[model samples]
Target: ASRLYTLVLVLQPQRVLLGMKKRGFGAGRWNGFGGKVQEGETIEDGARRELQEESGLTVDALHKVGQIVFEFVGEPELMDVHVFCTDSIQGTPVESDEMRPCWFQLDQIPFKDMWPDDSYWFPLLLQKKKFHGYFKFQGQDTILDYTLREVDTVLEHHHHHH
Candidate 1:
């Protein structure tokens, strides 16, 4: 079974807010703030909660920008990540136990220090385009294969079947 996760980026003008994970998965790397969605809560709500917990900022709305699936060689489960971006927020970003918040100019994004897949989809995100992607990783730092493409919509529209 695939596990649901959220990844939210704070986009403000020409800069973006990213957190350096202090520990656990993706530690020591600059990335967005988010984690696994909890039971009884919407995915967006989970994104909000995790963002607040990791970086002291609150966003009233989130724009869906991308969806990605990650498969690790030794892992049996796939991570289905919903990517969101927000320009409006409340409060200044504060460092937490899980993350150290920082802002990077659009032209100076630290791709070399982030997840490998980020380099592929970040351009689309910056262009305000929706995308879908899949990545198979041989290890934490090595991507074995991947596929990415721009999409008209990131969210799925439900259709009734007769």
Candidate 2:
């Protein structure tokens, strides 16, 4: 099965409200506002709803310029993640049961407190560049193994070591 979800990265000036991540969420260190797609809801709607429901903010101007597809262990299936960036949004960031949205300067982002992967691709997002990446890793190695199919497509069998 394929899973489709939307991740909302609402921006305000230099800071953005990343959701409060707790345990069991794994990526809890990430402070972005996002959730799974609801029944009969479009990806944009999912993004909008998540912004409002989870952060009490409204997307003033949203852009869907990026996306990613990858898989992780213990997941039901392949995942399609639609990424949205919103600046000039309204309201103040707040804390919810699931997230404690906070404002952080783009230059002073809480990298030390974020998921490891964010350190890699997040810069691309911060620069407002579109990216489509296939990340494959076994457990929490933070490095991709050539065994993953996505790596083959990305590297064309370019082996660093046999």
Candidate 3:
């Protein structure tokens, strides 16, 4: 079994918006605002909805920028995450029940309070590049192995088990 998730980053001129998750998975971590994909919605739609729901900001436009696969040791479930970026916003980011909105200067993002894997691809994101990453985690806070790279374009492919 696998789960799909979204991560939506709001980029400003010299700052980025983040949310301190108040509960559920990845709570207490300063992170991009998003959540699990819901039925009957596209990934981009879900991303927009989650961001607005958690931060009270309406996404004017979204650019799909990255993908990450997170596999945990001893677990069959893998998290397939779609990452998006936006500079267009419609409202102030208001703290909500699920998240407390925060802003960080580009050079001062608190990576120490975020997932260990975030630092890997976040730089590329700032560079306005597309990317893909695969991470194997020993636990929520520990990365066993991972790879991150810039991509010319994101693609979908068919895989067959042999």
Candidate 4:
């Protein structure tokens, strides 16, 4: 069965907020603030909750910006990760045990220090375009193959768009 996850990015015109995962699945990498969706909670709520827990910031509003399916070469499950973004929020970012918050300029994003596939979708986010992607990874450090495409917006289904 597939599992659900969330990732929220706080975007500003000149900078973006990302967190270095301090431990667990994505440890030692710079990425957005979010994690697995809990039972009964909406995905957006999961995103907001994880952001505040990991970064000390409360989301005022979240845009359903993108989505990706992560398939590991040998794993039985795929990760359906919903991506959200927002410019309006509350509080300053403070690091928690799980993450260290940091700001990066548009031209200074540390792609080499993030998941190999992040380099593909991140640019679309910066351009304010929506996207859908599929990544098949050989392991944590290598992407065997991937496909990404821009969309008009978030849709109920890939074929549901006008």
Candidate 5:
């Protein structure tokens, strides 16, 4: 089975906004704002909603930057993640119950406290390249294997599948 998820990155001139997950699945680590896509919303719509819910910022448009699938060794479900990036936003980010919003300089991304796979694909994201990737993880922090590549285009799908 595969579950849909959204991950949004707010990229400004030379800085990016990140949220420290205060509690839940990714607690204690800094990451982009997003979460599981709800049942009746489009993936992009879900992204916007998650961003606002978690960080209080909203964007009018989002660029589809990547698609990634994560498989945990002992888990049956796969996480199908759609990654989006935006250079513009409507409001200053405010911390929420689920996350602590903060801005980090481009050269100072806190990868060490982020998911291991982030270090690999984040550079591609920074370069403004579209990509698709798959990762197999042994646990929360160890990626057992992975494959990633740049793509010229990312096709949009309107529905989710299990």
Candidate 6:
């Protein structure tokens, strides 16, 4: 029931970039930004750590945009995803073994190299719209598609209660 991962988009006024590693998956052609979750880490922890691992950007705050699921037919190993958009961060960009941070214009996104569903939702995402989608696919080909418009940001502001 916990097959999920999280991501934070380290955005700037000039927009942000991504890096990826090819781990022999069919989607090895993917060069966008993000990573899987580590054991013993909360979803937010995983997202922060992943952003740190892939790029050196330190986030001040992140707004959870929404999530999507990649459900495999037989195993029930559904990949539930949590996505966040950063309001601010600290640090300069640095190349990671997994990726090279390169900025792109807000309109000039590199969609051809991204996953199939990106183009469908990325634009709205950049505009700060909250939404959820399901991209049922088989080997990188979308078989079914569903989307839900959001009424509120799911992420709460970070605070130290302890």
TM-score of each: 0.93, 0.78, 0.92, 0.93, 0.94, 0.81
Cα lDDT tens digits for candidate 1, 28-79 = 8999989998888888889999999999999989998999999999889999
Task: List the candidate numbers ranked by lDDT, top first.
Answer: 5, 1, 4, 3, 2, 6
lDDT of 3 by residue, 1-162 (tens): 877788999998899999998988778999998988887777777898899899999977988799999999999999889899999999888998889999899999899999888899888898899999999998665898998888998765221220
Off by over 4 Å in 6: 20-32, 155-162
Give the per-residue lDDT of model 4 (tens digit) for 27-115: 89999889998887777778988999999999779999999999998789999898999999789899999999999998999999998
- Model 6 TM-score, 2 decimals: 0.81
TM-score of decoy 2:
0.78
The CA lDDT at 141 in model 4 is 56
Best-performing candidate as measured by lDDT: 5
Cα shift from native, residue 49, model 2 (Å) = 0.9
User: What overall lDDT goes with each candidate model?
Assistant: 0.89, 0.67, 0.88, 0.88, 0.90, 0.66
Model 4, C-alpha of 118: deviation from truth (Å): 0.6
Better candidate number, 2 or 3, judged by TM-score: 3
User: Candidate 2's C-alpha lDDT?
Assistant: 0.67
CA RMSD (A), model 3: 3.4
lDDT of model 4 at residue 137?
87
Q: Cα deviation in Å at residue 103, candidate 5? A: 0.8
Local distance difference test, candidate 1: 0.89
| Winner by TM-score between candidate 5 and candidate 4 | 5
